[PDB]
From a paper:
Here, we report the atomic structures of an engineered diffocin, a contractile syringe-like molecular machine that kills the Gram-positive bacterium Clostridioides difficile. Captured in one pre-contraction and two post-contraction states, each structure fashions six proteins in the bacteria-targeting baseplate, two proteins in the energy-storing trunk, and a collar linking the sheath with the membrane-penetrating tube. Specific attachment of baseplate tail fibers to receptors on the surface of a target bacterial cell triggers conformational changes of the neighboring baseplate, which leads to reorientation of sheath proteins and contraction of the entire sheath assembly. Since the sheath and the tube are anchored together at the opposite end by the collar, collapsing the sheath pushes the tube through the baseplate, driving it to puncture the cell wall and underlying cytoplasmic membrane.
The external diameter of the sheath increases from 19 nm to 22 nm, and the inner diameter increases from 8 nm to 10 nm, which enables the detachment of the sheath from the tube. In contrast to the pre-contraction sheath, the post-contraction sheath exhibits evidently subtle motion, as revealed by the three-dimensional variability analysis of post-contraction sheath segments. The shape of the diffocin in the pre-contraction state mirrors a syringe, and its typical length is about 146 nm. During contraction, the sheath layers of the trunk are compressed by about 47 nm.
Residue numbers in the entry:
A (entry chain B): 2 to 354
B (entry chain J): 305 to 354
C (entry chain K): 254 to 304
D (entry chain C), E (entry chain N): 204 to 253
């Protein structure tokens, strides 16, 4: 309709955008006390609630010291004594995190936490990890650090109490580098123990602290799983590889659910656009040197053919290209190949005169 | 259309398919069509091998 | 051994370019030692293909 | 919107508010542009000259 | 940081502390530069002149 003359000038900003990916470097911390119960949200190193016990403050201080840099965010939840673990566990399932730790826990608590982690990593499709004092849990979700009588600052520490420092050390490092052979200037002595014993413990999936060169260092941080199926390969035993896999999973899932779920029609061209977006994300990750340069993503073919045959359609004469043409009805099948890099660990040099 | 023509008693044994389609129907129209309806993506299955 | 353990262990990703950089560093150290007249002038370092 | 022609006070002085014609209903024959004074005037002069 | 303009005693005399605007939320089109008095002022003058 004809209205009054319109003169409008609009001002907008060039919204230069880098996509917000899943946060990494957050630590889930749980502790039991009668003061300041619940989460405490220690985002900053300096600020600490005062009603907490001094010893627990020491535990926080061990938690804060990062490996290369300070942990991005620290979440400490205070629980009432004897309230069991589930009461805290639901609270933690409410929010996101990366690593969980318990200074004070009986073996029943460790069993409960390990069962929770295994069920959560496979049922709820959420990738989290936790460090435990002494467990033989055979999953990728737990790291078993085991060293007795650790002396930090003239004070003795058991393994369970030191797990906080181990978790902070793990979360401090960037994804580019690894944890193996990292100096811990805080610790000043460990009970003496031989090299072949270290070989035996490391081959068990156990994480051990070693005295080598001038300082005190972690000896080849590895996972806890020991049996190697045809499904779970050797590389699943390294912390760095499983961590970058978790990050990849979280980012891909977040993108998929946030944009392409229930908003775009299931057609071949939309599949191509989704593949292009996935490949763009993979190339962006490759730029940061976490995976190899060349990777490929392609629509899964055999699963699609099996799905069509399960529906009774006759696919005898249609060509492979026509097979990929076929409608699937709100189902998408894709496969992708990547190669994960690792940090230098063993160097073999041969010099002849 | 063939069934309707049979119902009125016309003898269509010899008449060929195009001639059957040609026959008058008297204000009756019979049509059939086929389509395929798209849907939004709902379930995504991604398989990655290292 | 001291250089390798201090700088290149658990801090550099295993890639072709990183290996080339390590080779360059090793060759630089060898040349520096050659300046002190302990080895002959020309020395070569390269990736061990057979192993 | 009624086809009414009005006078509006805006900016410094008094100004005419988008001089339009009087017709309001738009047929398939009489399009939108027949509502502007300038267009109908140039159509009239074209008609008279030809 | 709360979008408030404050008076600060520092150096020899009393001076303004980074004169900023009252808006605090940042949207997609309202970027960072929309928080400065000088920038919004020159934008306003451009709008009026044009």
């Amino acid at each position: 309709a004809i209205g009054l003359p319109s003169i409008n000038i609009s001002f907008k900003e060039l919204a230069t955008t880098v996509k917000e990916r899943s946060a990494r470097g957050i630590i889930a911390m749980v502790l039991k006390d009668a003061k300041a119960l619940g989460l405490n949200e220690i985002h900053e190193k300096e600020d600490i609630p005062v009603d907490l016990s001094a010893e627990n403050k020491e535990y926080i201080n061990l938690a804060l010291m990062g490996n290369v840099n300070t942990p991005n965010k620290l979440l400490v939840y205070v629980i009432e004594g004897e309230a069991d673990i589930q009461t805290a566990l639901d609270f933690l399932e409410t929010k996101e995190f990366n690593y969980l730790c318990m200074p004070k826990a009986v073996e029943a608590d460790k069993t409960a936490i390990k069962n929770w982690i295994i069920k959560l990593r496979d049922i709820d499709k959420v990738k989290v990890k936790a460090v435990l004092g002494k467990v033989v849990g055979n999953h990728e979700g737990i790291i078993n650090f085991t060293t007795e009588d650790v002396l930090v600052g003239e004070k003795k520490y058991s393994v369970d109490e030191f797990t906080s420092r181990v978790a902070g050390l793990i979360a401090g490092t960037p994804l580019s580098q690894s944890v193996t052979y990292t100096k811990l200037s805080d610790v000043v002595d460990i009970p003496k123990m031989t090299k072949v014993d270290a070989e035996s413990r490391v081959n068990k999936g156990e994480l051990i602290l070693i005295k080598e060169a001038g300082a005190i260092r972690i000896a080849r941080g590895v996972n806890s799983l020991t049996e190697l199926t045809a499904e779970k390969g050797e590389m699943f035993q390294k912390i760095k590889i499983v961590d970058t896999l978790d990050i990849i999973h979280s980012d891909i899932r977040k993108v998929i659910i946030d944009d392409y779920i229930g908003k775009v029609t299931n057609s071949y061209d939309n599949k191509c656009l989704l593949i292009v977006a996935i490949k763009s994300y993979l190339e962006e990750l490759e730029k940061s040197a976490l995976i190899e340069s060349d990777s490929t993503v392609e629509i899964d073919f055999e699963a699609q053919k099996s799905y069509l045959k399960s529906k009774g359609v006759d696919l005898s004469y249609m060509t492979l290209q026509e097979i990929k043409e076929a409608n699937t009805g709100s189902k998408v099948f894709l496969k992708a190949k990547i190669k994960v890099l690792d940090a230098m660990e063993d160097i073999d040099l041969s010099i002849e005169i």
